[PDB]
């Protein structure tokens, strides 16, 4: 329920800042120790899903509320996404999942459970179909 809540005491602010520092440095260095191939894929995914997230903003929130009001776990979700992937072979459904997962992430504050989800779901999302789409662009 919101963000300002967990930031109760002074310690919590400093502890958050330190934790944010570590995560941002690990991430920036990571980008730098990446091949230009990966780097370009990152560019492709970045504009597509930054667009999807922006164009279908309210559909993201709509799906967020659909996920809330029901007792729903990360795992059953991944499985559903996987079943979808087996028949829907469009690019759209994959991009939309990435953006929806990204929305789920922005709202969770546990970094550990969040990265687990990112990790599990990105496996599922990157089936052979999706990979073929990404490699064949610029």
């Amino acid at each position: 329920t919101n963000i300002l809540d967990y930031l109760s005491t002074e310690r919590d602010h400093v502890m958050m800042a330190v934790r944010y520092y570590m995560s941002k440095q690990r991430l920036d260095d990571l980008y730098r120790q990446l091949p230009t191939k990966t780097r370009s894929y990152i560019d492709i995914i970045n504009i597509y899903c930054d667009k999807v997230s922006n164009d279908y903003n309210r559909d993201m929130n709509i799906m967020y509320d659909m996920a809330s009001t029901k007792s729903f776990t990360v795992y059953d979700f991944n499985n559903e996404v996987n079943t979808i992937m087996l028949d829907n072979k469009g690019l759209g459904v994959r991009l939309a999942t990435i953006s929806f997962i990204t929305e789920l992430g922005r709202r969770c504050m546990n970094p550990v459970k969040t990265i687990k989800m990112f990790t599990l779901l990105s496996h599922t999302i990157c089936d052979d179909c999706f990979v073929d789409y990404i490699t064949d662009i610029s």
Partner: peptide
């Protein structure tokens, strides 16, 4: 149950498809 979110996601995806296999 859960495929309500599933359907929604595919629907969005179909819109995304029709919008880049044209102008």
């Amino acid at each position: 149950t859960m495929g309500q979110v599933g359907r929604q996601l595919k629907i969005i995806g179909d819109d995304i498809n029709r919008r880049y296999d044209s102008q």
